[PDB]
Short mmCIF file of C-alpha atoms in Angstrom, two decimals:
data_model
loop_
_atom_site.label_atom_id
_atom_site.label_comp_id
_atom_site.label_asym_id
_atom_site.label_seq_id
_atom_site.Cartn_x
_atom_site.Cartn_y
_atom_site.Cartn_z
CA UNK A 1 -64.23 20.53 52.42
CA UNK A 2 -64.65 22.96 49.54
CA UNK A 3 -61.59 22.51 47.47
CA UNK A 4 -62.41 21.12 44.19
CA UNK A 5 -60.86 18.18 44.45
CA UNK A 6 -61.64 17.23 48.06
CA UNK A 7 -64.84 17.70 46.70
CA UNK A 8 -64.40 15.56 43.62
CA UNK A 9 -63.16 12.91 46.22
CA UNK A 10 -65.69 13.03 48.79
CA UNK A 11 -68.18 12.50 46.21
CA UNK A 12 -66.36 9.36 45.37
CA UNK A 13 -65.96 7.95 48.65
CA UNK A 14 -69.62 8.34 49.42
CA UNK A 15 -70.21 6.01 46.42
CA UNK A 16 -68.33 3.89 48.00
CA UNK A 17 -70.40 3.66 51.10
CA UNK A 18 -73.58 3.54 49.31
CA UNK A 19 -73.38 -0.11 48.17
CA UNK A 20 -76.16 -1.88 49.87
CA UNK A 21 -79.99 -1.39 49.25
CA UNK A 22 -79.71 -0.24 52.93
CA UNK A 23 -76.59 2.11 52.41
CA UNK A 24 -77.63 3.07 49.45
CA UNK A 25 -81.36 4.99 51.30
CA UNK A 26 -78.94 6.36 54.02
CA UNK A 27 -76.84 7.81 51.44
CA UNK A 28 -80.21 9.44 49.95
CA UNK A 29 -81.23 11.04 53.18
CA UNK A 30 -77.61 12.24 54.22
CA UNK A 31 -77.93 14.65 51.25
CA UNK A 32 -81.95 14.99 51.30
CA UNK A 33 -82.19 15.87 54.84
CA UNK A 34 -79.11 16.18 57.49
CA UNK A 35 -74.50 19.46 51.07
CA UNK A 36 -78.40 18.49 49.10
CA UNK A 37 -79.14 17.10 45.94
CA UNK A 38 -80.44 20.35 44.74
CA UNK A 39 -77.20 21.55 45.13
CA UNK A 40 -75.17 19.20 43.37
CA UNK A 41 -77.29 19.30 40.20
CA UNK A 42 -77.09 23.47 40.50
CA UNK A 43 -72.69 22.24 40.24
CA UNK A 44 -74.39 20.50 37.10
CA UNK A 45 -75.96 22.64 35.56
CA UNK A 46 -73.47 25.42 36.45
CA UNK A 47 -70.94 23.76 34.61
CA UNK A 48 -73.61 23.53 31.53
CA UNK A 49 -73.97 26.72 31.37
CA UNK A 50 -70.31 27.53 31.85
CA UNK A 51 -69.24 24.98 28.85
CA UNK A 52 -71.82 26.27 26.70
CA UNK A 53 -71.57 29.83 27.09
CA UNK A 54 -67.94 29.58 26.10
CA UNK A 55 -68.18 27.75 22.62
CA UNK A 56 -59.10 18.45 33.24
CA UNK A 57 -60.73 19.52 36.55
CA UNK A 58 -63.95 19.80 35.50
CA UNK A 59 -63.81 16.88 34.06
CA UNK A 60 -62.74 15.28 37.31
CA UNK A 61 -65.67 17.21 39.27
CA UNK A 62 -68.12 15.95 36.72
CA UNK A 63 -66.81 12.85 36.57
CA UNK A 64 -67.66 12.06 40.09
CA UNK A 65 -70.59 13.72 40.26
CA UNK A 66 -72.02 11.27 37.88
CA UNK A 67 -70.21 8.46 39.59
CA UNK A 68 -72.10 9.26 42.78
CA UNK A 69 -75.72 10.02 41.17
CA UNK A 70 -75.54 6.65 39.12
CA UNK A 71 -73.93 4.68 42.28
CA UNK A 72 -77.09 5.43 44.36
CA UNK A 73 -79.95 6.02 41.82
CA UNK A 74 -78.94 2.10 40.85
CA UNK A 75 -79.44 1.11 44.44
CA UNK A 76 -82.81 2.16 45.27
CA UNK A 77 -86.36 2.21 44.97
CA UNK A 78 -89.30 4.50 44.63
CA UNK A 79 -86.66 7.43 45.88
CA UNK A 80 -85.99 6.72 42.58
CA UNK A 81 -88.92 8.66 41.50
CA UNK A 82 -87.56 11.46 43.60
CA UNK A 83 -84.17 11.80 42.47
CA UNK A 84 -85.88 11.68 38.81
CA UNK A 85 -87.99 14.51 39.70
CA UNK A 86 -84.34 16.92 40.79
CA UNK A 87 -81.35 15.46 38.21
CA UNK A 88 -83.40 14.67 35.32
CA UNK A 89 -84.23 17.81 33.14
CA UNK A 90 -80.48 19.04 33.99
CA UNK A 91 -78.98 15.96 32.98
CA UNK A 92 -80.81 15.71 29.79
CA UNK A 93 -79.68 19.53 29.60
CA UNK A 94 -75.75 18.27 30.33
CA UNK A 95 -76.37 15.35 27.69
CA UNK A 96 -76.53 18.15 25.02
CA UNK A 97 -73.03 19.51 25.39
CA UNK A 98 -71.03 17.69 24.09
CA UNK A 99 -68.66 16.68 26.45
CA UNK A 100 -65.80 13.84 26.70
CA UNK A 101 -69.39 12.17 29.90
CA UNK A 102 -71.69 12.21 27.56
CA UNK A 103 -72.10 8.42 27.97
CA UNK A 104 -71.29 8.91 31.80
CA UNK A 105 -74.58 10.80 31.59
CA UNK A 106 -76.99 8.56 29.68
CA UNK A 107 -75.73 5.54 31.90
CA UNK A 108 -77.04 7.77 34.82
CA UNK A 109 -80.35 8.71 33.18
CA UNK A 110 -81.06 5.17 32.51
CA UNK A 111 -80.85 4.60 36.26
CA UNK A 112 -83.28 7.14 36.79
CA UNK A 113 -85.65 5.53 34.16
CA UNK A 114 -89.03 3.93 36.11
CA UNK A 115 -90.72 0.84 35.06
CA UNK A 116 -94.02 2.24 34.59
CA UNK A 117 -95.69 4.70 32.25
CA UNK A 118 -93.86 7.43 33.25
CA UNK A 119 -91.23 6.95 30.85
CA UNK A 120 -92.73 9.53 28.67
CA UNK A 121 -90.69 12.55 29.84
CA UNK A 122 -87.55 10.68 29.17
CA UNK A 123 -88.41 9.47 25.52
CA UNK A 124 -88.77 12.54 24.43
CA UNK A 125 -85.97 13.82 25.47
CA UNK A 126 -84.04 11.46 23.36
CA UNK A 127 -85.94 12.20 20.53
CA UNK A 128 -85.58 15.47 21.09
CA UNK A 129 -81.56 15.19 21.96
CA UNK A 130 -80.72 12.77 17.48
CA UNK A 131 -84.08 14.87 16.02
CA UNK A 132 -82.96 18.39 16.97
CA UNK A 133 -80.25 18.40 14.33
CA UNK A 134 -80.96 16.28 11.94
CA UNK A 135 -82.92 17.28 8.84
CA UNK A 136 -84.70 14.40 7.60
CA UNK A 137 -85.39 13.61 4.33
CA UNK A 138 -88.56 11.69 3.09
CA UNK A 139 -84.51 8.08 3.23
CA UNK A 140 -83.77 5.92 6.10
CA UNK A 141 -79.96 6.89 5.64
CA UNK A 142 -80.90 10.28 6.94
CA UNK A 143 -82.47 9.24 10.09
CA UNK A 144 -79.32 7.04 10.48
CA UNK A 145 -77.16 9.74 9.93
CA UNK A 146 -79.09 11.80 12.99
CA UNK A 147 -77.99 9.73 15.56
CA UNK A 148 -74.78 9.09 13.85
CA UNK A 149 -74.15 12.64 14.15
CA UNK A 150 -74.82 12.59 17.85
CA UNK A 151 -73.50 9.47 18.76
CA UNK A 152 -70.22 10.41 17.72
CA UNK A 153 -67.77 8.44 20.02
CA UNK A 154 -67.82 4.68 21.68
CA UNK A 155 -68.77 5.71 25.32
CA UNK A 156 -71.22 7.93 23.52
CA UNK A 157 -72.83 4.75 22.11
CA UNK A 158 -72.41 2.49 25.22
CA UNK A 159 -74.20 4.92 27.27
CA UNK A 160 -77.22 5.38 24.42
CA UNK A 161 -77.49 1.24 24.54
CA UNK A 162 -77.94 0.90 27.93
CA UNK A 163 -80.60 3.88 27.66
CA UNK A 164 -82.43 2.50 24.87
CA UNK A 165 -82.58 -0.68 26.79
CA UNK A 166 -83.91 0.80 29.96
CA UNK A 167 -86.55 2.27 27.93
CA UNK A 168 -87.46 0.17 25.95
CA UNK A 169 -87.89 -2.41 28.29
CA UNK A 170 -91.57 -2.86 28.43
CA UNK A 171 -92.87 0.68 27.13
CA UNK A 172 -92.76 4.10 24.87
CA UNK A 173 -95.22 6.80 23.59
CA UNK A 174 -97.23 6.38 20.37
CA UNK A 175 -97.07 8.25 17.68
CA UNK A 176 -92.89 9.45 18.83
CA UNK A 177 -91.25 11.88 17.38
CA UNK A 178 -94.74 13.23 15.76
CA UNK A 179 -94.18 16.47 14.25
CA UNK A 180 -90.64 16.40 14.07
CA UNK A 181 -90.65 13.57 11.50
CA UNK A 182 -91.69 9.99 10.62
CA UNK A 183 -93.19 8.86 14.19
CA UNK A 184 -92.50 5.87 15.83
CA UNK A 185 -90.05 3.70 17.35
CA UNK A 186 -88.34 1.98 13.81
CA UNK A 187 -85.24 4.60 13.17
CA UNK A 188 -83.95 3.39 16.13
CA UNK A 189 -83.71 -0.21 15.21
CA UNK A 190 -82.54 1.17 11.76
CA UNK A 191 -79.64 2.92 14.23
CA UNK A 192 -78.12 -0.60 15.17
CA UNK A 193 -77.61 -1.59 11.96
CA UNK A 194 -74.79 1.09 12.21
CA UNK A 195 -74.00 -0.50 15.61
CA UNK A 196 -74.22 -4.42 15.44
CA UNK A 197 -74.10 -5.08 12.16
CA UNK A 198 -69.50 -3.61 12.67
CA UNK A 199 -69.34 -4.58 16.48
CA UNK A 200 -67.54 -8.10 14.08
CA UNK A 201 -65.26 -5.39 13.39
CA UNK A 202 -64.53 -3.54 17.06
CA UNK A 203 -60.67 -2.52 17.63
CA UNK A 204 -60.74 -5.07 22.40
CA UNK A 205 -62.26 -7.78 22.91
CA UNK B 1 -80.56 2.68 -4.38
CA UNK B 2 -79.89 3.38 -1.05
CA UNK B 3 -81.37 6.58 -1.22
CA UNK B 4 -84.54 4.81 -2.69
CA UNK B 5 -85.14 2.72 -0.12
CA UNK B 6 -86.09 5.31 2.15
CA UNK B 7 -89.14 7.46 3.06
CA UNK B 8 -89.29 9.55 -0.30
CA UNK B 9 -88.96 12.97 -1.98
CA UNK B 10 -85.19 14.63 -3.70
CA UNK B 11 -84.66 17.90 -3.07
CA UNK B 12 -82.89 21.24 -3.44
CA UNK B 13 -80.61 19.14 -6.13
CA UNK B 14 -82.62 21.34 -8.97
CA UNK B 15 -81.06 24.55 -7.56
CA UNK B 16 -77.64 22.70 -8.47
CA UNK B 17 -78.92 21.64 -11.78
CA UNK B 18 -80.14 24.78 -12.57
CA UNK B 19 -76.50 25.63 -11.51
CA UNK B 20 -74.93 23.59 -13.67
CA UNK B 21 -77.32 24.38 -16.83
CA UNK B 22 -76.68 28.09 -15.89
CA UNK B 23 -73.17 27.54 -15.87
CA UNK B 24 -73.34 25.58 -18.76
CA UNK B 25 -75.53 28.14 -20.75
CA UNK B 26 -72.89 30.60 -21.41
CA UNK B 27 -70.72 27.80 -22.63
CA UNK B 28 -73.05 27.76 -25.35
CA UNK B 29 -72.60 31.36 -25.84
CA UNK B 30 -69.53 31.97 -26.10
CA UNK B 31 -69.15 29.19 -28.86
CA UNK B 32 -71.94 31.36 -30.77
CA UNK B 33 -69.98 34.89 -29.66
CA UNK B 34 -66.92 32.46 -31.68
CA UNK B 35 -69.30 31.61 -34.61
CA UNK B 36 -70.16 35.49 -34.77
CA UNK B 37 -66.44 36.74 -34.66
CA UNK B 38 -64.88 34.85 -37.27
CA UNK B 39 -67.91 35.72 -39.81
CA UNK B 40 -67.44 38.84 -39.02
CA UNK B 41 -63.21 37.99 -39.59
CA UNK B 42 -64.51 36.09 -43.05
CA UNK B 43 -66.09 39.15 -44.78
CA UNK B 44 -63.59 41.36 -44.84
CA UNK B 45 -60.81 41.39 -49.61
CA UNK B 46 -61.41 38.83 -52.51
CA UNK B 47 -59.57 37.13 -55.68
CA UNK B 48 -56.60 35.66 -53.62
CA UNK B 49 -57.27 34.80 -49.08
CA UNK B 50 -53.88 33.12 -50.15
CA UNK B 51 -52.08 36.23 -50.27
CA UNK B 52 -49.45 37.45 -48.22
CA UNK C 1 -44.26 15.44 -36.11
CA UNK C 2 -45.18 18.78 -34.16
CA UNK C 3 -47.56 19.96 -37.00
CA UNK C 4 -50.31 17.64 -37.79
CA UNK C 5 -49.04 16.95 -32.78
CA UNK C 6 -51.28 19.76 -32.68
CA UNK C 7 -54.15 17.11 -32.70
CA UNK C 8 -53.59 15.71 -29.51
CA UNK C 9 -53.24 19.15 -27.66
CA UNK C 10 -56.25 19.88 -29.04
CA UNK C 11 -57.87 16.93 -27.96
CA UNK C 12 -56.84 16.76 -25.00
CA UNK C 13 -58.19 20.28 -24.35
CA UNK C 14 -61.63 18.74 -24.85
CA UNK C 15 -61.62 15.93 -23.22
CA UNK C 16 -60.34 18.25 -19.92
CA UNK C 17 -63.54 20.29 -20.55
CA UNK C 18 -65.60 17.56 -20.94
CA UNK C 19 -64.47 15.78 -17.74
CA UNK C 20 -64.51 18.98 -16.36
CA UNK C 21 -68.30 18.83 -16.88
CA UNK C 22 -68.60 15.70 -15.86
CA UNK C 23 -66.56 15.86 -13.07
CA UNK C 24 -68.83 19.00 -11.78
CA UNK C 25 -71.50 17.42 -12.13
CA UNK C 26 -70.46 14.68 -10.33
CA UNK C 27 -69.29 16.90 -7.64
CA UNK C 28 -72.83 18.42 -7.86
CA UNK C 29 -74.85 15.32 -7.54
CA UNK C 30 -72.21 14.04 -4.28
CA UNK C 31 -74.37 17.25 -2.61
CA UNK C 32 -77.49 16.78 -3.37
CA UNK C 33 -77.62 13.16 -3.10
CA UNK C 34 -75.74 12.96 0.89
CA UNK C 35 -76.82 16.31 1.55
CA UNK C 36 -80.00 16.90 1.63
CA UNK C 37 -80.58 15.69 4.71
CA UNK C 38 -82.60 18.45 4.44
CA UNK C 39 -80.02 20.77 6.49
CA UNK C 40 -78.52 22.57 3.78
CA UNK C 41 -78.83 25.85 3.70
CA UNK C 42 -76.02 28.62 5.42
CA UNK C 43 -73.38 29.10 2.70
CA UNK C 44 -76.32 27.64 0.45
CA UNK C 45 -78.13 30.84 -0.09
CA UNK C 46 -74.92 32.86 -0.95
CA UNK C 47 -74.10 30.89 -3.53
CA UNK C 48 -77.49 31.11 -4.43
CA UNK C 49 -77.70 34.82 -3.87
CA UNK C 50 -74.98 34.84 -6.45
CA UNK C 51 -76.09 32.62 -8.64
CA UNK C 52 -79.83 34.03 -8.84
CA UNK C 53 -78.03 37.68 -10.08
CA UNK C 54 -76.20 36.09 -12.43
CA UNK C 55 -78.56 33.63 -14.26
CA UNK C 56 -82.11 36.03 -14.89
CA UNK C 57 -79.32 38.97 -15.34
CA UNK C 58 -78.42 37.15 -18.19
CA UNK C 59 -82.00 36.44 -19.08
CA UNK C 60 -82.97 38.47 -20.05
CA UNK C 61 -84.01 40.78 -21.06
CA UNK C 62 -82.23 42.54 -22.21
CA UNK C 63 -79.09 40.88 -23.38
CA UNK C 64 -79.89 38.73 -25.83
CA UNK C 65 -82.37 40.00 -27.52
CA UNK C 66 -81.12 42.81 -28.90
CA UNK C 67 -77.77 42.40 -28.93
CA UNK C 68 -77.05 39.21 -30.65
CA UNK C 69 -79.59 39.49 -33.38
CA UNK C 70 -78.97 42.61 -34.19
CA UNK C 71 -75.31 41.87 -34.59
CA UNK C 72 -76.20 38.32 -36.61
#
């Protein structure tokens, strides 16, 4: 069933069905071998293209996409690795737009995230994603202000957290952000003084 | 202070200070184009400015 | 009352031109200060288009020279 919103729903209900370690593999070859993942991220970055190139449904189409993706990337193991590698580069490419989702997206990515090394791809592209924009002066306020600038709303933020704290469990490049600006991993830190320092003063509990 | 504590460098703030010198200049200058005119308004019939 | 009241029209003129200079350059240093940030430019160079005519036009050569001394 075709019609957006079946659609929309059946991507919800497979979440559903997903939930154990063992559902959740099934669920990864339903759409891997016997509706594939290719396609879905081709909906996703359709609708990139589509939102950019212009500058409620979709919303409810993308909504569940990401549902689904994060329900099952959560839930497995080194098919992890495969769904990373493929919904990564066109998520990172959806994270850019800015979107309602935005968080929706980054709480997705982080699922992708592996333990090992191979974090490298996704560091940069948050670098890349708080960097692009920003023009950096040689001082600290203006590295604040670059994520400030992209982490404009509170899902935005929730989503970057639970990012940062995939990553940054255990690992990162050296020398980050090298070229762009003054490397390393300390503007970030710098980033929740915006963040916790504020969170005494939240609305909502 | 803020700013201070911070990698380094100011910039393209002397392009407004030039633009505020610049638009102060003629400020000057018209003062002086004043000083000019009312010589100019002072040399013109003696014994008696008092005069109707 | 009105005659020597002139005073504080006067006065007062001043004062508005000299906040006025102040309050420009306050309004200058509230961009560079914030903004760089090292983004600026856009707008920027228009104004600076406009402003680069105007200030060397001045300049130089030819204006001042000539004119004002050989007037004074």
């Amino acid at each position: 069933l075709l019609p957006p919103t079946i659609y929309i729903p059946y991507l919800k209900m497979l979440q559903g069905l997903a939930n154990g370690p063992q559902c959740a593999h099934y669920c990864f070859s339903l759409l891997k071998v016997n509706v594939s993942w290719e396609h879905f991220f081709h909906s996703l970055m359709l609708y990139h293209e589509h939102l950019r190139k212009d500058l409620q449904k979709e919303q409810d189409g993308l909504i569940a996409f990401l549902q689904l993706t994060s329900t099952i990337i959560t839930w497995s193991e080194n098919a992890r690795l495969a769904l990373c590698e493929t919904p990564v580069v066109v998520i990172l490419g959806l994270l850019q737009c800015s979107i309602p989702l935005k968080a929706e997206l980054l709480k997705t990515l982080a699922a992708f995230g592996k333990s090992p090394e191979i974090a490298a791809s996704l560091w940069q592209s948050l670098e890349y994603t708080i960097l692009q924009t920003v023009r950096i002066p040689s001082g600290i306020e203006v590295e604040l202000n670059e994520i400030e600038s992209r982490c404009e709303e509170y899902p935005l933020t929730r989503a970057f957290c639970q990012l940062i704290s995939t990553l940054v469990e255990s690992s990162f490049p050296s020398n980050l952000g090298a070229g762009l600006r003054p490397p390393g991993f300390d503007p970030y830190l710098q980033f929740l003084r915006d963040s916790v320092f504020r969170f005494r003063t939240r609305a909502r509990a | 202070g803020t700013i201070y504590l911070q990698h380094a460098d100011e910039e393209r703030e002397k392009t407004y200070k030039l633009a505020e010198n610049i638009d102060a200049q003629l400020k000057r200058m018209a003062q002086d184009l004043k000083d000019i005119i009312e010589h100019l308004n002072t040399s013109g019939a003696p014994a008696d400015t008092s005069d109707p | 009352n009105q005659t020597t009241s002139v005073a504080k029209i006067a006065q007062y003129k001043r004062k508005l031109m000299d906040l006025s200079h102040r309050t420009l350059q306050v309004l200058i240093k509230q961009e560079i200060q914030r903004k760089s940030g090292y983004a600026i430019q856009a707008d920027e160079e228009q104004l600076r288009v406009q402003l680069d005519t105007i200030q060397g036009e001045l300049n130089a050569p030819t204006q001042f020279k000539g004119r004002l001394n050989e007037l004074m």
